[PDB]
Amino acid sequence: NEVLVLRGTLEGHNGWVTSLATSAGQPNLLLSASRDKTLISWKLTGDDQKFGVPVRSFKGHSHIVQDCTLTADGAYALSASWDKTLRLWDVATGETYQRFVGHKSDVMSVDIDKKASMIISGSRDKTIKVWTIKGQCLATLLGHNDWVSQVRVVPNSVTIISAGNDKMVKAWNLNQFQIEADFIGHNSNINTLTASPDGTLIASAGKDGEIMLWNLAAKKAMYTLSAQDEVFSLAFSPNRYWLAAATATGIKVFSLDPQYLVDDLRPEFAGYSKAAEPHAVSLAWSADGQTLFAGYTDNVIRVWQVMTA
Ligand SMILES: [Mn+2]
């Protein structure tokens, strides 16, 4: 008796909302990144026709901000930018504490370990970099033969996973700075990947809309879910066996146990033309899993909540 219901919007960005992040420490805080070169922290009220408001603007990047995340406590933000750098921000003030310089091209992805002791990034320079929180590059991981689109830390000795336009998904052992597993099977550019909260599964997808699920430990492919259209973002529910996928035609929410389509979220748009309908390119679940945030190509964040029918 549970459905996803459109609750409201968060307006304030002036470019595609490319990335979203929530935090367990601050369940009322949302972080967003945009092609408008900025990030925005939001205060969530969840009230009427204004689910929340912008509290801070994070300005400093000279190009598109592609990815962002918050530390566990929500005190700090990380951003990856096409300007070839990452920045660590003080969420309270909106200031940049540290710059991360080293990539030779667009930085497409950023993530951080649970201890918030080291930072990982992916770039169109084909490399993955490991940094200290003080902005010092420690090492560069080589193996991808094309752009790296996304890098993520696997929840659990740190293990990360990456995907790129070489159709490869890779797991790396940071204790060795070496490849742990090659996941072959994608036939198209991979836009996004993510690890299940228990760190046992990998989900990855891109252009052809094929969402491949991998058994990390066994280093094997399990099955593929057809989303039909290009997938831009994937996000496992923190508390449900649900996998949300932002696609060119809507947000498909898959139940994995048992297997069925929870929903295909498709908002009604203005009167845009069909040809020009905006779509979601970013996703984030709230810590409690009762809220799903999605950033769109019309600069708007849309908010769904799990309610009783
Ligand atoms: Mn993370």
* Cα gap 240→234, rounded to integer Å: 14
Q: How far is the CA of 58 from the centre of ligand 1 (A)?
A: 19
- What is the DSSP code string of 54-69? EEEEEE--SS-EEEEE
Q: How far is the CA of 138 from the centre of ligand 1 (A)?
A: 19
Q: How far is the CA of 268 from the centre of ligand 1 (A)?
A: 31
Q: How far is the CA of 153 from the centre of ligand 1 (A)?
A: 6
Q: How far is the CA of 111 from the centre of ligand 1 (A)?
A: 5
Query: Is the Cβ–Cβ distance between 303 and 288 less than 8 Å?
Result: no
State the burial class of residue 56 (Cβ atoms within 10 Å of its Cβ: 0-12, 13-18, 19+): buried
What is the C-alpha radius of gyration for the chain, rounded to an integer number of angstroms?
18
Q: How far is the CA of 10 from the centre of ligand 1 (A)?
A: 22
Q: How far is the CA of 199 from the centre of ligand 1 (A)?
A: 12
Query: CA dist 251 to 56, 140, 170, 226, 304, Å?
Result: 28, 34, 26, 13, 11
Parallel/antiparallel/unpaired status of strands 118-123 and 280-285? unpaired
Helix, strand, or coil (residue 92): coil
Q: How far is the CA of 227 from the centre of ligand 1 (A)?
A: 24
Query: Is the Cβ–Cβ distance between 80 and 67 less than 8 Å?
Result: yes
Q: How far is the CA of 202 from the centre of ligand 1 (A)?
A: 14
Q: How far is the CA of 146 from the centre of ligand 1 (A)?
A: 23
Angle among Cα 104, 106, 107 to the nearest 5 degrees reads: 100
Query: Is the Cβ–Cβ distance between 237 and 203 less than 8 Å?
Result: no
- What is the DSSP code string of 130-160? EEETTS-EEEEE---SS-EEEEEEPP---EE
State the burial class of residue 177 (Cβ atoms within 10 Å of its Cβ: 0-12, 13-18, 19+): middle
**Annotated domain spans of the chain:** 7-309
Q: How far is the CA of 11 from the centre of ligand 1 (A)?
A: 25
Q: How far is the CA of 70 from the centre of ligand 1 (A)?
A: 7
254 contact partners, CB below 8 Å, separation of at least 6: 211, 225, 242, 243, 244, 245, 260, 261, 262
Q: How far is the CA of 49 from the centre of ligand 1 (A)?
A: 30
Q: How far is the CA of 201 from the centre of ligand 1 (A)?
A: 15
Q: How far is the CA of 274 from the centre of ligand 1 (A)?
A: 35
Q: How far is the CA of 69 from the centre of ligand 1 (A)?
A: 6
Query: Is the Cβ–Cβ distance between 253 and 263 less than 8 Å?
Result: yes
Query: CA dist 55 to 12, 30, 52, 88, 93, Å?
Result: 10, 10, 9, 18, 10
Q: Please, after which residues is the chain broken with C–N above 2.5 Å?
A: 156
Amino acid occupying residue 243:
L
Q: How far is the CA of 14 from the centre of ligand 1 (A)?
A: 25
Q: How far is the CA of 180 from the centre of ligand 1 (A)?
A: 20
Query: Is the Cβ–Cβ distance between 135 and 99 less than 8 Å?
Result: yes
Experimental approach was: X-ray
- Dihedrals phi, psi of 275, to nearest 5 degrees: -50, -35
- What is the DSSP code string of 258-282? TEEEEEEE----TT--GGG---EEE
Q: How far is the CA of 306 from the centre of ligand 1 (A)?
A: 23
Query: CA dist 52 to 28, 280, 284, Å?
Result: 9, 19, 15
Nearest in space to 22 (alpha carbons), one of 295, 218, 227, 216: 295
**Which fold is adopted by the domain 7-309?**
Methylamine Dehydrogenase; Chain H (2.130.10)
Angle among Cα 61, 66, 72 to the nearest 5 degrees reads: 90
Q: How far is the CA of 267 from the centre of ligand 1 (A)?
A: 28
* Cα gap 5→265, rounded to integer Å: 9
Q: How far is the CA of 218 from the centre of ligand 1 (A)?
A: 23
Query: Is the Cβ–Cβ distance between 118 and 130 less than 8 Å?
Result: yes
